[PDB]
Amino acid sequence: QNSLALHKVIMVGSGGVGKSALTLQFMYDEFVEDYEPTKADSYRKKVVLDGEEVQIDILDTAGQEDYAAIRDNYFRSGEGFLCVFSITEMESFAATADFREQILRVKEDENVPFLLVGNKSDLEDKRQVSVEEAKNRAEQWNVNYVETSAKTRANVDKVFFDLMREIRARLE
Ligand SMILES: Nc1nc2c(ncn2[C@@H]2O[C@H](COP(=O)(O)OP(=O)(O)O)[C@@H](O)[C@H]2O)c(=O)[nH]1
Ligand SMILES: [Ca+2]
């Protein structure tokens, strides 16, 4: 009846960027390459965050919602956001602006816990989005930029843990 902190994370970003692959790497320690692109789902896991046992809830969104009101309701439920793009697809980086605005409209707080996540860092030779331009956007938004690979696990725990650290600090 002792209650753990429950950190509600939402994955956002355009299609194919790695939302599900990041989620499933974090949850199950597997790189999953064919996860149904239209499927949204939630995941929960106990994690030890800076020595404190907590629960993380991850909503892996898929952009499928029947109404804007439904999408906004999901976003309103979230406490922090991983805003993912693929470093190999410039258009997915451009699309992060829309997710940022959607989140800000619902959460009404420019300091909402939020990381800009450039995924597919193992595909450096296919990079379309420079580190510099992504860092500059993160600086404009006052968020951290982290590059990840769901394939190699690089920075996967970091993005989820660092987002939980922002939720913990900012929603106190
Ligand atoms: N090389 C590489 N491929 C990735 C990575 N993350 C996702 N993928 C691939 O990109 C595709 C889309 O990933 P997915 O997680 O389903 O994208 P979502 O639509 O954002 O959920 C799949 O074929 C994945 O295997 C990554 O970090 N590196
Ligand atoms: Ca997905």
Tab-separated table of C-alpha atoms and ligand atoms in Angstrom:
chain	number	residue	atom	x	y	z
A	1	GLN	CA	0.000	0.000	0.000
A	2	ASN	CA	3.188	2.005	-0.082
A	3	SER	CA	2.854	3.739	-3.467
A	4	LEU	CA	5.737	4.176	-5.901
A	5	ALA	CA	6.221	7.306	-7.938
A	6	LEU	CA	4.715	6.717	-11.384
A	7	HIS	CA	6.473	8.624	-14.150
A	8	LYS	CA	4.251	8.931	-17.238
A	9	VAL	CA	6.362	9.153	-20.403
A	10	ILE	CA	4.956	9.658	-23.892
A	11	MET	CA	6.877	8.809	-27.059
A	12	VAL	CA	6.114	11.190	-29.924
A	13	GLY	CA	7.566	11.719	-33.373
A	14	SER	CA	6.777	10.973	-36.987
A	15	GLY	CA	6.597	7.545	-38.594
A	16	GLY	CA	9.550	5.211	-38.666
A	17	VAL	CA	11.787	7.257	-36.375
A	18	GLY	CA	12.166	4.557	-33.707
A	19	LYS	CA	9.508	5.257	-31.084
A	20	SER	CA	8.574	1.598	-30.767
A	21	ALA	CA	12.116	0.304	-31.200
A	22	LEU	CA	13.322	2.597	-28.417
A	23	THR	CA	10.423	1.562	-26.168
A	24	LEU	CA	10.928	-2.149	-26.777
A	25	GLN	CA	14.707	-1.917	-26.326
A	26	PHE	CA	14.150	-0.178	-23.010
A	27	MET	CA	11.399	-2.585	-21.926
A	28	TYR	CA	12.639	-5.927	-23.196
A	29	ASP	CA	16.322	-5.534	-24.171
A	30	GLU	CA	15.563	-6.469	-27.774
A	31	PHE	CA	15.879	-4.560	-31.054
A	32	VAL	CA	12.501	-5.026	-32.734
A	33	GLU	CA	12.393	-4.077	-36.387
A	34	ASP	CA	8.883	-4.785	-37.650
A	35	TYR	CA	6.547	-3.513	-34.952
A	36	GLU	CA	3.154	-2.661	-36.462
A	37	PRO	CA	3.477	1.023	-37.465
A	38	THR	CA	-0.168	1.874	-36.607
A	39	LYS	CA	-0.226	0.262	-33.151
A	40	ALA	CA	-0.187	2.462	-30.070
A	41	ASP	CA	0.369	0.771	-26.733
A	42	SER	CA	1.413	1.434	-23.156
A	43	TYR	CA	4.139	-0.280	-21.152
A	44	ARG	CA	4.975	-0.240	-17.471
A	45	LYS	CA	8.157	-1.279	-15.701
A	46	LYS	CA	9.679	-0.943	-12.267
A	47	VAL	CA	12.993	0.936	-12.421
A	48	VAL	CA	15.480	2.062	-9.785
A	49	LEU	CA	15.939	5.782	-10.511
A	50	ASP	CA	18.842	7.318	-8.585
A	51	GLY	CA	18.314	4.704	-5.903
A	52	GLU	CA	14.524	5.082	-5.646
A	53	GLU	CA	12.238	2.334	-6.875
A	54	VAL	CA	9.722	3.921	-9.238
A	55	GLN	CA	7.405	2.833	-11.998
A	56	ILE	CA	7.719	4.169	-15.514
A	57	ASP	CA	4.699	4.140	-17.793
A	58	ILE	CA	5.517	4.586	-21.483
A	59	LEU	CA	2.827	5.463	-24.017
A	60	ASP	CA	4.169	4.530	-27.441
A	61	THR	CA	2.031	6.662	-29.725
A	62	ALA	CA	1.348	5.937	-33.392
A	63	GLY	CA	-0.483	9.054	-34.619
A	64	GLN	CA	-3.668	7.115	-35.290
A	65	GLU	CA	-6.170	8.933	-33.093
A	66	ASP	CA	-9.693	9.344	-34.460
A	67	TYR	CA	-9.961	12.961	-33.238
A	68	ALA	CA	-7.575	15.686	-32.150
A	69	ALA	CA	-9.426	15.639	-28.835
A	70	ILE	CA	-8.312	12.045	-28.280
A	71	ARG	CA	-4.684	12.821	-29.153
A	72	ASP	CA	-4.779	15.829	-26.838
A	73	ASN	CA	-6.247	13.673	-24.054
A	74	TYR	CA	-3.368	11.217	-24.383
A	75	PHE	CA	-0.837	14.061	-24.338
A	76	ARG	CA	-2.544	15.670	-21.338
A	77	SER	CA	-2.088	12.369	-19.449
A	78	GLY	CA	1.655	12.490	-19.967
A	79	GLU	CA	4.145	14.021	-17.588
A	80	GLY	CA	7.161	13.996	-19.897
A	81	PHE	CA	7.852	13.526	-23.594
A	82	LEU	CA	10.528	11.892	-25.672
A	83	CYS	CA	10.253	13.776	-28.950
A	84	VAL	CA	11.970	11.424	-31.381
A	85	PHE	CA	13.210	11.963	-34.904
A	86	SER	CA	15.534	9.937	-37.083
A	87	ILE	CA	18.915	11.461	-37.860
A	88	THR	CA	18.567	9.808	-41.279
A	89	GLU	CA	15.307	11.595	-42.232
A	90	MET	CA	15.331	15.383	-42.323
A	91	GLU	CA	11.553	15.531	-42.638
A	92	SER	CA	11.199	13.745	-39.288
A	93	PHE	CA	13.355	16.435	-37.696
A	94	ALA	CA	11.183	19.116	-39.257
A	95	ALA	CA	8.118	17.316	-37.880
A	96	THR	CA	9.339	17.601	-34.268
A	97	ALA	CA	8.170	21.236	-34.282
A	98	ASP	CA	4.573	20.058	-34.649
A	99	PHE	CA	4.813	17.624	-31.741
A	100	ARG	CA	6.380	20.356	-29.618
A	101	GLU	CA	3.490	22.702	-30.388
A	102	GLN	CA	0.906	19.984	-29.730
A	103	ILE	CA	2.473	19.286	-26.348
A	104	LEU	CA	2.706	22.960	-25.451
A	105	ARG	CA	-0.926	23.597	-26.359
A	106	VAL	CA	-2.075	20.823	-24.037
A	107	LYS	CA	0.434	21.139	-21.192
A	108	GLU	CA	0.628	24.970	-21.320
A	109	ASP	CA	4.105	24.847	-19.815
A	110	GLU	CA	7.200	25.478	-21.887
A	111	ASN	CA	9.222	23.668	-19.218
A	112	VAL	CA	7.264	20.431	-19.539
A	113	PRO	CA	9.730	17.529	-19.181
A	114	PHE	CA	10.892	16.925	-22.744
A	115	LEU	CA	13.962	15.561	-24.500
A	116	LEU	CA	14.716	15.965	-28.188
A	117	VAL	CA	15.928	12.525	-29.263
A	118	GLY	CA	17.834	11.959	-32.485
A	119	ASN	CA	17.534	8.230	-33.040
A	120	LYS	CA	19.427	5.905	-35.427
A	121	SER	CA	22.819	7.201	-34.306
A	122	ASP	CA	24.319	3.973	-35.628
A	123	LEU	CA	23.561	5.190	-39.172
A	124	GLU	CA	26.019	8.089	-39.170
A	125	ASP	CA	26.804	7.507	-42.860
A	126	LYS	CA	23.098	8.093	-43.638
A	127	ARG	CA	22.771	11.231	-41.492
A	128	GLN	CA	20.531	13.950	-42.904
A	129	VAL	CA	20.205	16.089	-39.749
A	130	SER	CA	23.390	17.647	-38.416
A	131	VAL	CA	24.246	17.436	-34.732
A	132	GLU	CA	24.636	21.221	-34.841
A	133	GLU	CA	21.160	21.940	-36.170
A	134	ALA	CA	19.549	19.544	-33.688
A	135	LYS	CA	21.518	21.037	-30.787
A	136	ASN	CA	20.467	24.494	-31.958
A	137	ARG	CA	16.807	23.509	-31.941
A	138	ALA	CA	17.153	21.988	-28.476
A	139	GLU	CA	18.797	25.212	-27.290
A	140	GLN	CA	15.927	27.236	-28.764
A	141	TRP	CA	13.452	25.087	-26.812
A	142	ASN	CA	15.594	24.862	-23.664
A	143	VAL	CA	15.631	21.055	-23.805
A	144	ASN	CA	18.449	18.561	-23.946
A	145	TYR	CA	19.345	16.813	-27.167
A	146	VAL	CA	20.433	13.189	-26.973
A	147	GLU	CA	21.275	10.874	-29.846
A	148	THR	CA	20.251	7.272	-29.412
A	149	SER	CA	20.337	3.966	-31.194
A	150	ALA	CA	17.589	1.482	-30.523
A	151	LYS	CA	19.752	-0.980	-32.442
A	152	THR	CA	22.942	-0.713	-30.365
A	153	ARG	CA	21.232	0.516	-27.137
A	154	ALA	CA	23.342	3.694	-27.147
A	155	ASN	CA	21.769	6.262	-24.812
A	156	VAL	CA	18.488	4.363	-24.582
A	157	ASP	CA	18.486	4.116	-20.799
A	158	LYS	CA	19.816	7.673	-20.683
A	159	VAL	CA	16.833	9.222	-22.458
A	160	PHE	CA	14.264	7.419	-20.315
A	161	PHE	CA	16.131	8.004	-17.051
A	162	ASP	CA	16.941	11.643	-17.826
A	163	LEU	CA	13.308	12.294	-18.727
A	164	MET	CA	12.212	10.734	-15.451
A	165	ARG	CA	14.716	12.963	-13.666
A	166	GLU	CA	13.023	15.984	-15.265
A	167	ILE	CA	9.577	14.726	-14.262
A	168	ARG	CA	10.803	14.177	-10.702
A	169	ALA	CA	12.364	17.646	-10.441
A	170	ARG	CA	9.661	19.666	-12.162
A	171	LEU	CA	6.491	18.047	-10.834
A	172	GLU	CA	8.065	17.645	-7.337
B	1	LIG	N1	19.587	1.204	-37.700
B	1	LIG	C1	18.559	1.535	-36.890
B	1	LIG	N2	17.297	1.245	-37.263
B	1	LIG	C2	16.301	1.603	-36.424
B	1	LIG	C3	16.572	2.238	-35.151
B	1	LIG	N3	15.391	2.445	-34.546
B	1	LIG	C4	14.433	1.986	-35.369
B	1	LIG	N4	14.998	1.454	-36.465
B	1	LIG	C5	14.300	0.867	-37.598
B	1	LIG	O1	13.399	1.813	-38.140
B	1	LIG	C6	12.131	1.193	-38.424
B	1	LIG	C7	11.061	1.963	-37.689
B	1	LIG	O2	11.207	1.813	-36.278
B	1	LIG	P1	9.936	1.938	-35.333
B	1	LIG	O3	10.458	1.894	-33.930
B	1	LIG	O4	8.900	0.940	-35.744
B	1	LIG	O5	9.427	3.420	-35.725
B	1	LIG	P2	8.115	4.200	-35.143
B	1	LIG	O6	7.176	4.290	-36.306
B	1	LIG	O7	8.707	5.542	-34.734
B	1	LIG	O8	7.567	3.403	-33.979
B	1	LIG	C8	12.252	-0.273	-38.056
B	1	LIG	O9	12.586	-1.019	-39.217
B	1	LIG	C9	13.412	-0.283	-37.108
B	1	LIG	O10	14.115	-1.495	-37.056
B	1	LIG	C10	17.968	2.527	-34.828
B	1	LIG	O11	18.280	3.110	-33.772
B	1	LIG	N5	18.892	2.147	-35.725
B	2	CA	CA	5.571	2.532	-33.641
